[PDB]
Structures are given as C-alpha cells and as structure tokens.
Structure 1
Amino acid sequence: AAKDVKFGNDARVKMLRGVNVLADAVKVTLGPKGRNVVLDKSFGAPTITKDGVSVAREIELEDKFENMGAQMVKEVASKANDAAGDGTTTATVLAQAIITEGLKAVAAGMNPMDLKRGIDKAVTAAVEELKALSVPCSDSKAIAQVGTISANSDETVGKLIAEAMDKVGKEGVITVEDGTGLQDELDVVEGMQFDRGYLSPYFINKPETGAVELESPFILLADKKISNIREMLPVLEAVAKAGKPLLIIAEDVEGEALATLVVNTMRGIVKVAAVKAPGFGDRRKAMLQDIATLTGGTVISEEIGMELEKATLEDLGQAKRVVINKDTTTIIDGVGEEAAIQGRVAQIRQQIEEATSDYDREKLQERVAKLAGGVAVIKVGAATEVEMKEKKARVEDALHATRAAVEEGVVAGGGVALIRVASKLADLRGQNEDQNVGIKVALRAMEAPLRQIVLNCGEEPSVVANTVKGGDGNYGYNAATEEYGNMIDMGILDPTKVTRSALQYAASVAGLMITTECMVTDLP
C-alpha cells in the first residue's frame, strides 16, 4: 500500500504537537488539589475521575503523525509504573519539559549528538546525588509508620503489615484475600512463586487488575514442545467432567493448539491457562521436578517413555489456588506431604555440600530457600461488605508501597527532592559549548513538578520555588496547609525508587526523539 514520508523540521513540528496534547490532558490531576476529568462511555452516564492512568489510557488523535508521537511517549512512560508502582504523571511531565527546550535549541543550529551526550551526563550526576541524600528505613517501627502514612492514617493496616512481615521475613511473599467477617487472621501454608507470564491475553477474567485467578484447579506438567492440540483431547475430556479448571506448564505452545485453546476458553466451555516453565537447561527439568513434588502430580517426559495419551486423572496435580499476573505466577497451598518435602530438602542440601563451584552452590542455595521457605495469607473482615472490599484495596496499595520502601529507602517527597538535587549541581561542565547547553536544559527541566503543584493551588510559582531553593536540607513546602518546614516530620515522603525510575525513563525517551530524521506512514 502506498506510503507517505516526511523529512526533518516538517516531521518534528508534528511530533511536538502530539506530545503537547497528551501532556495537557494528563497534567491537571497532579497533587492534592487536582481538578477533574470527564470520560465518555457508550452506554449510560459519563465517568468523572481524578486519576492519571485512566485518562492516559484513552487518548488517541486523528492525524497520523501526531498520533505516532503521542503513542511513542506513552509506551515509555508506562514502564516506570509497571516497575515501581507509581509515577506515570511525573514521567510524562518531565518528558514534555525536556523535549520542548531541546527542539527549540536544535532549531537554532547546534548539533544534536552533543545535546544528547550532555543530557545523559547531567542525569547520571543527579542520580549520584539522589542516592547520597536518602535516609534508611529498616526497623519494624519505621515499617509500621511508613505503611500507616501510605494508607491514609490507619494504624490497623500498618501494624498488620508489619507483624506479618516479621512473621515471614523481608524476602517472603505476602498475599491478601477475603475473610469470614470482622476479625483479622494471618497464617502460613505451602506455596510457590516464579517469573513467567501468561502466554497470551484474553485469558483475563477480572479486568480491574488485568490478572487471572483460578480456584482449586488442575495442573499438568509437560516436558516437551506442543503445537498440535490433537494429543491433548483425552486429558481435556477427563478434565471436562467434574467441572474444574486447568493450568498447563510446558516449555512452549505454538500455533494451532494456542489458537484453539484461546477460542475454547473464550467461548465459555472449559477453563484453561498455560505458561512456560522457569529457566532453561537441565535446571528447567529440575524445577519441574520440584514443582511436581510440591503438588504431587506427574511429570510427563518423553525421554523416559511417556506420551500424552498415556495419562489418567490420577496423574494430574491439584491445589488450592493459583494467580497469574502479567509477568509473575503464584501457587497457593497444594497437597504435598511433609516427608517428601523433607527428603527433597535433604537431597538438595547434600548436593550443595557436594558442589565444586561457587556458581552452582549459589544457585542451589536459591533453590533450597525457595522450597523450604513458605507463604503467608492475610484475611480481612469488615461487616457490611462494601467496607470490606474498600479496605482490601487499601491494604493492597499499602503492601506495594512498603515493599518498595524497604528496598532502597525514602526521601522528602511532594516534589522537593528533585529541586534540592538540581540545586546542588551548579558547577557541572563538559567538553565544548554544546554540551554545556545540554546540561543547562536538563537542570532547568528538573523543576517542573513543583511548579505545577503550586500552580494548581492558586499561588505564584516563582516566589515559592525561589524560597525553597534558598534553604538547605529537607526544608520544604506543604501543599495541604500552606506551611514551610521539615518535610519529614509532616509525614510527606516517597520511596527513592520511583523518583529514580521516572527521571531515567523520561531522559531516555527525550534523547531518542531529539535525534530523529525521517518518518514513514500510511496514506489517508
């Protein structure tokens, strides 16, 4: 089909227009005084919202080039949210702030590659500072305080989170689900978790979280490569009776069987989801064996002489609950006996003692920790269901925040950390003129979030920014009350990880977009 191409300045102006529309739509909802946005739907009343993610998901424009620009900034921005748990809006605002200044500079005749190099240098120095300024948070009392603050001033959730984390340990896995009514419980059972996502969309049955959840399903182990659904019919029918769902872990499923399973699970009849085994090499077989021992199923390996028609209903595995996220998989409370687990642990323990290299020894240490560790379950009850579901959502949010915090530490939030860092770096210089210009652009763009937050509260931005630069330490500004002071005592703070991630990802996308030359697309 015929295409259409655009060169240079003509392309850059279009891309700029697209990013401008996206930024203006998203950035009013920043801060604690945010305005509202109205989203239309086909059926019924519109929706009113105050959240950045929901607004960002919807935008797509008319003209082709501008839409390409918007999509391109959007995809990069999303990853920070996926990785850390907050900060999409901040990334978008930073990207706009760098791109505008950079393109204005480029139109005046400076080289692009120099600007790129300068911006990267400034970002790296800033990250060094940001690590230096932080403060630790390791003891249990601080854990409780952080959880309480993140959950909008409720001591119950905070102390519950803290006590559970003490129960299992900082590296453990924590899961939350519904209880039986107005009393909190927490317990330990046999569980598992590993890094493999679903093989395809449309397995989702609960759109709110984009995740798949199955209760008391059947589990099938496959040590082979499957592409033809023909040999799956006997086990599929045996599972069709008794009305129970199914989970397939193999090395890979391609083509015919994949599409057929998609259609079958999408037309109701039968419930099946499938994923790849963890790792590769002989360790892949070893981990399959370990999962088999845990669930008490059957490993079907061709080399020993199995085939798919050869399995009966006894051979499958059965367990309490399974959850599949986009890139993580969790198994909760199977059936295994203690004796088999203990023997497995003994064998792997001695193989550790038998090791001849640090690499294999450390891998085996991983495996024993994963197996003989455990899982913890939290049950919350609230007496009038509506409150119960609301509380459950809040607990989940607090859990993510606490994990991210204990990883790397916290720092004065609300947008002051970045301005403090950028104030400590007035000295930085480069090789020639152009790198100096690039450094200045990055430093002057690091101020956008605080100026916006102040602008929503109907104040004068420049005065407040000037005063905040004037001081030292954590001395900052509180938007909710109009006061200066120690930001750490007023209970406004953020994990370090989110600030670092936002900064790096925005810098990346701006760098790519400064130095493009041609654009190729379809014809209207």
Structure 2
Amino acid sequence: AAKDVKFGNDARVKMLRGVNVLADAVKVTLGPKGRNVVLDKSFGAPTITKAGVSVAREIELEDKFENMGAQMVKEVASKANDAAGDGTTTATVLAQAIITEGLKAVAAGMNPMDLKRGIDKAVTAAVEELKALSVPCSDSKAIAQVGTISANSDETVGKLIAEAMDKVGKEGVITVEDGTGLQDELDVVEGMQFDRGYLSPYFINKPETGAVELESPFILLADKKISNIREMLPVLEAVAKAGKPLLIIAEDVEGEALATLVVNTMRGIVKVAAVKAPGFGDRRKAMLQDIATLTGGTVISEEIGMELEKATLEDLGQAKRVVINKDTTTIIDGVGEEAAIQGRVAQIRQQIEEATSDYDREKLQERVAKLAGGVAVIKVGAATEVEMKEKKARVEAALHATRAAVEEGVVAGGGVALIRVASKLADLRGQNEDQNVGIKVALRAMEAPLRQIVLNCGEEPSVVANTVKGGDGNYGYNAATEEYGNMIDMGILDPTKVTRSALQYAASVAGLMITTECMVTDLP
C-alpha cells in the first residue's frame, strides 16, 4: 500500500502522543491506592484488571503514528511480564518518563544517539547498584509480605503462599487453579503420587470407595505390554510362594491378563493390582528408574537383553504400604535407603543444565517433588467469574513475585530503591555533554514510580519525593497509612529482579524510541 511518511518534530510529537495515551491508560492501576480497568472483549463479558500488561495489550490507536508509538511501548509491559510477572506498570511509567524527558533533550538539538548511550550507561550502573542493594529473602514472614504486596496488599495471599512454600519446600513446585468454593482452598500432595488410577474396578480392599490398599507390597516395572499369563509363571508362582501382595507397572495390560488377575484375586490366592505407565516415551522410563530406586528394586526393560521371563526377587521393588484409587496412584514408604534417595537427589542436579527454561524446570520440579518433597495446588475462591479471573491473576502474579524475591532477593518498595540508587549515581558521567544529559535523563526518570504512586494517592508527589530524598537508608513513604518510616520494617518490599528488569526493558525501548527522525506507515 502507498505509504504515509513523516519526519522529525511532527513524527516525534505523534509518537509521544500515542505513548502517553497507552501510559495514561495504564498508570491508573499503580500503587496501593491504584484503580482498576475494564476491557471489552468481542466474545463474552468484559474483564476487570489491575495488571498493566493486559490493558497495554488491549490498547490500539486509530492514528497510525500514535498507534506505532503505543505498539512499541507495549513491549515494555510484555517483556516485563514474560520475565518476572510483576512491576510492569512501574516499567511502563519509567518508560514514559525516559521518553518525555528524552524528547525534551532532543528538542534542545542534542544528538539522540548519545542520549541513548548516556541512558544505557546510567541504567547499567544502576543495575549493578541494585544487585548490590539486593537483600536475601528467606523467612516465611518476608515471603508472606512480598506475596501480600504483589497481590495489592491482600494478606490472604501472603499467608497462602506462605503455607504452600512452607509445606512443599522453598523451591518446590506450586500451581494455582480456579477454585470450586468461595474461599481459597489449598491442596497438598506429599511423597510419591502420580496420575492414572486402577484398571479393573473388580478389585476391592478393607475400605470401600474402590480404592485398594496393600500390606508390605511388591512392585514390578516393565517397558512393553503383556498378553500371556502363563508367561508370568516364574514371577506369580514365586509370589504365590510368598503370599505377599503384588503391584505391576507397564504402559498397559490387555483384557485377558487383567481377567486372570481379577479371577485369581477374587478367589483370594494372591492380591494384585495393575496400573498404566505415568508418562510417554522416554519420560515414563526416566521416572520408572527413580521409582525403582525409591522402592529398592531393579528396572526390567525389554529394550535390554533382560526379558519378561527372567525375573528375580531382587528385581522386585519393595514398600511398606501402597494406595491406588480411581484416578491416582500413591506410594507411602519406599524401603530404598536414605543414602540411595539422597544420591538420587544428587544425580538430579545434573538434569538442570538442559533448559529448555521453565518447561525443564517444571518437569524437573515435578519429578523431584515425587521424592521427599511435595506438590502444592492453590484453588482460588471467588463469588463470581470476574472476581475469579482477577483474583487468580493477582495470585499467580504474587507467586511469581515471591519466586523472584527468593531468586534474586528484595529491596525497599515504594519505589524508594530507584531514588536511592539514582542519588548514589549522582556523580556518574559520560564521554561528552549530551551523554551526561542522557545519564541525567535516566536518573531523573528513576524518581517516576514513587511520585506516580503518590499522585495516585492524591498527595503532592514533588513534596513526598523531596522529603524521601532528604532521608537515608530504607526511609520511605507508606501510602496505605500515609506515614513515613522504614519500609522494610513496615513490610513494603519489591523483589530485586522485577525492579532491575523494569529499569532495563524500559531503558532499552525508550532509548531506541528517542532516536526517531522518520516514520513510514500505511495511508488511511
């Protein structure tokens, strides 16, 4: 299509206009006294949210140039969210400050590229300063605090994530779903448990419900399917010579073998249950090995010379109790020694260097949690669907925030961190005057979060800013109680990772964005 082209001040003003539309559209959700946004959707009912990224994503402008600007600044929120999962609004505001002040510096006639350079320098130094200021977050109290703040000061979330991480372990895997009831409910699975229930409902035990429990059970593992039942002679007879109940694991077992199983179990000669393999292809075997080590038995595999026939009482695994229900399989206690299990945890460390980032991390934490650890599922309660969506979003985000807080530590919230590191980099300089101006632009922009929060609280931002800048250390302004004090002692802490990320991303996009001298877009 024929293109519309614009140059210089015209284009820059246009862009800035679009950017500011997006920014103003996002900013209303910042701070403890922030406000929500409703997004219409072509299909169903609209969405209410406080999460900046969503509103940014929904934003699109009619004026092609304004559209361009907004569509470029959206990447701030998007990348921020994709990276850490919180503080996206902060990032956006930073971006706006850098872009505005930057363009102002360009209007003085200064070299844009050098401005970008200065900004980049300042931001790098700031990142190092943050990495230094970062304080480790280990106690359940602090974690509760981060979770609370990331959920917009809702301590329910704090205590919830607290109980979760406390029970599973500080690194263990936690997931969250839409709840059934109105109140938040936490489900926790301890020890070895996985999907796929029993095959034949014909099996029953001492309790009801169809779930089968076994006393001092024996475990077998196989790679292939089975069809013959006479072929199970060397094993079954042995078990028939022991009297002890048996458990079998493979991808499947056909109707006739299961029939034999049901008949022999019903006549009461031996109690046996059968359950399909957990995963697919390589993964199911990779898990079968660890299950074997946990039980104490040895894996049998058709892909190796060892056949289904050759089966010994040492190849069989051992446990104290096993329970299998309709959908899930559960092992209570494997006789595998603590040294063996610990060694398994050792060998697991090798499996980390194959990311495949969060997919490898999720599968790895999944298989690891089936050891001494555990799995936590948070079911978020709400009255109506909108409440459900927003609440779940906030809870997820809170989880990500606590995770990042554990990973890279925390710094004093209320955006006082940026003020502190700027005030520390006050003496930072560049290779020439314009670059110095760039440095000053970045630093000046670093005050933006706090003052924006204060603006959203209906209080004079310049004043609060200056009064906070006048202080030292973790001195900051608590917006909820409208009083100054030590932010950490008041429990307002932002994960270092999210702040660092915000600053970096915003600095990148804005730094490039202020280097525009020409724009080409489609003609209307």
- 5+ residue gaps in structure 1? none
Partners in 1 of 2:315 and 2:416 — Cα distance?
A: 59
1:75-133 alpha-carbon deviations (Å, 9 max, x no partner): 23311022212122222211121112222322333223322221111111111222233
- Are the counterparts in 2 of residues 189 and 332 from structure 1 also a CA contact under 8 Å? no
Moved more, 4-13 or 326-335: 326-335
Moved more, 116-125 or 25-34: 25-34
CA pair 203-484 structure 1, distance change in 2 beyond 3 A: farther
CA pair 342-44 structure 1, distance change in 2 beyond 3 A: closer
CA pair 188-338 structure 1, distance change in 2 beyond 3 A: farther
Moved more, 285-294 or 125-134: 285-294
Moved more, 127-136 or 337-346: 337-346
Partners in 1 of 2:318 and 2:445 — Cα distance?
A: 55
CA pair 87-191 structure 1, distance change in 2 beyond 3 A: farther
Partners in 2 of 1:156 and 1:508 — Cα distance?
A: 36
DSSP 3-state at the match of 1:161: helix
Moved more, 160-169 or 273-282: 273-282
- Are the counterparts in 2 of residues 95 and 506 from structure 1 also a CA contact under 8 Å? yes
DSSP 3-state at the match of 2:330: strand
Moved more, 310-319 or 142-151: 310-319
Moved more, 264-273 or 107-116: 264-273
CA pair 131-441 structure 1, distance change in 2 beyond 3 A: same
Residue 504 of structure 1: how far off its partner (Å): 0.4
- Are the counterparts in 2 of residues 151 and 394 from structure 1 also a CA contact under 8 Å? yes
Residue 206 of structure 1: how far off its partner (Å): 40
Residue 280 of structure 1: how far off its partner (Å): 17
CA pair 248-181 structure 1, distance change in 2 beyond 3 A: same
- Are the counterparts in 2 of residues 190 and 333 from structure 1 also a CA contact under 8 Å? no
Residue 145 of structure 1: how far off its partner (Å): 4.8
Moved more, 339-348 or 100-109: 339-348
1:277-326 alpha-carbon deviations (Å, 9 max, x no partner): 99999999979999999999999999999999999999999999999999
- Are the counterparts in 2 of residues 138 and 406 from structure 1 also a CA contact under 8 Å? yes
CA pair 282-89 structure 1, distance change in 2 beyond 3 A: same
CA pair 39-402 structure 1, distance change in 2 beyond 3 A: closer
Moved more, 316-325 or 182-191: 316-325
Partners in 1 of 2:266 and 2:122 — Cα distance?
A: 50
Matched, 1:438 2:447: no
Partners in 2 of 1:241 and 1:42 — Cα distance?
A: 68
- Are the counterparts in 2 of residues 345 and 372 from structure 1 also a CA contact under 8 Å? no
Aligned counterpart, 2:501: 501
Moved more, 303-312 or 57-66: 303-312
Residue 503 of structure 1: how far off its partner (Å): 0.4
Moved more, 70-79 or 512-521: 512-521
Partners in 2 of 1:162 and 1:370 — Cα distance?
A: 21
DSSP 3-state at the match of 2:427: coil
Residue 514 of structure 1: how far off its partner (Å): 2.4
Moved more, 37-46 or 280-289: 280-289
CA pair 245-29 structure 1, distance change in 2 beyond 3 A: farther
Moved more, 5-14 or 384-393: 384-393
- Are the counterparts in 2 of residues 352 and 365 from structure 1 also a CA contact under 8 Å? no
Residue 213 of structure 1: how far off its partner (Å): 30
Residue 376 of structure 1: how far off its partner (Å): 3.6
Residue 447 of structure 1: how far off its partner (Å): 1.4
Moved more, 55-64 or 178-187: 178-187
CA pair 329-482 structure 1, distance change in 2 beyond 3 A: farther
DSSP 3-state at the match of 1:289: helix
Partners in 1 of 2:368 and 2:440 — Cα distance?
A: 51
Partners in 2 of 1:243 and 1:29 — Cα distance?
A: 67
Residue 173 of structure 1: how far off its partner (Å): 0.8
CA pair 357-144 structure 1, distance change in 2 beyond 3 A: closer
Moved more, 210-219 or 62-71: 210-219
- Count matched residues: 524
Partners in 1 of 2:61 and 2:512 — Cα distance?
A: 22
Residue 467 of structure 1: how far off its partner (Å): 1.4
- Are the counterparts in 1 of residues 145 and 493 from structure 2 also a CA contact under 8 Å? no
CA pair 142-315 structure 1, distance change in 2 beyond 3 A: same
CA pair 74-374 structure 1, distance change in 2 beyond 3 A: same
Residue 414 of structure 1: how far off its partner (Å): 1.7
Partners in 2 of 1:119 and 1:15 — Cα distance?
A: 19
Aligned counterpart, 1:235: 235
- Are the counterparts in 1 of residues 172 and 369 from structure 2 also a CA contact under 8 Å? no
Aligned counterpart, 1:320: 320
Partners in 2 of 1:201 and 1:389 — Cα distance?
A: 38
Moved more, 43-52 or 416-425: 43-52
CA pair 449-262 structure 1, distance change in 2 beyond 3 A: farther
Partners in 1 of 2:373 and 2:294 — Cα distance?
A: 12
DSSP 3-state at the match of 1:494: strand
CA pair 42-10 structure 1, distance change in 2 beyond 3 A: same
Residue 515 of structure 1: how far off its partner (Å): 2.5
- Are the counterparts in 2 of residues 227 and 258 from structure 1 also a CA contact under 8 Å? no
DSSP 3-state at the match of 1:253: coil
- Are the counterparts in 1 of residues 216 and 320 from structure 2 also a CA contact under 8 Å? yes
1:35-77 alpha-carbon deviations (Å, 9 max, x no partner): 5656556799987765534432322111222211210111233
CA pair 226-163 structure 1, distance change in 2 beyond 3 A: same
- Are the counterparts in 1 of residues 203 and 212 from structure 2 also a CA contact under 8 Å? yes
Moved more, 173-182 or 285-294: 285-294
DSSP 3-state at the match of 2:323: strand
Partners in 2 of 1:269 and 1:58 — Cα distance?
A: 66
Residue 244 of structure 1: how far off its partner (Å): 35
Aligned counterpart, 2:464: 464
CA pair 238-100 structure 1, distance change in 2 beyond 3 A: farther
DSSP 3-state at the match of 1:310: coil
CA pair 384-326 structure 1, distance change in 2 beyond 3 A: same
Residue 445 of structure 1: how far off its partner (Å): 1.4
Residue 268 of structure 1: how far off its partner (Å): 46
Aligned counterpart, 1:363: 363
Residue 487 of structure 1: how far off its partner (Å): 1.9
Residue 33 of structure 1: how far off its partner (Å): 3.0
- Are the counterparts in 1 of residues 173 and 369 from structure 2 also a CA contact under 8 Å? no
Partners in 2 of 1:296 and 1:422 — Cα distance?
A: 59
Aligned counterpart, 2:40: 40
Moved more, 247-256 or 433-442: 247-256
Aligned counterpart, 1:402: 402
Moved more, 363-372 or 273-282: 273-282
- Are the counterparts in 1 of residues 76 and 88 from structure 2 also a CA contact under 8 Å? no
Aligned counterpart, 1:260: 260
Residue 14 of structure 1: how far off its partner (Å): 2.6
CA pair 33-434 structure 1, distance change in 2 beyond 3 A: same
- 5+ residue gaps in structure 2? none
Identity %: 100
- Are the counterparts in 2 of residues 192 and 375 from structure 1 also a CA contact under 8 Å? no
Partners in 1 of 2:97 and 2:227 — Cα distance?
A: 49
- Are the counterparts in 1 of residues 86 and 401 from structure 2 also a CA contact under 8 Å? no
* Structure having the higher Rg: 2
Moved more, 165-174 or 293-302: 293-302
Aligned counterpart, 1:483: 483
Partners in 2 of 1:53 and 1:93 — Cα distance?
A: 12
CA pair 512-155 structure 1, distance change in 2 beyond 3 A: closer
CA pair 519-27 structure 1, distance change in 2 beyond 3 A: same
Residue 164 of structure 1: how far off its partner (Å): 3.7
- Are the counterparts in 1 of residues 265 and 272 from structure 2 also a CA contact under 8 Å? yes
CA pair 155-348 structure 1, distance change in 2 beyond 3 A: closer
Partners in 2 of 1:266 and 1:70 — Cα distance?
A: 70
Moved more, 500-509 or 471-480: 471-480
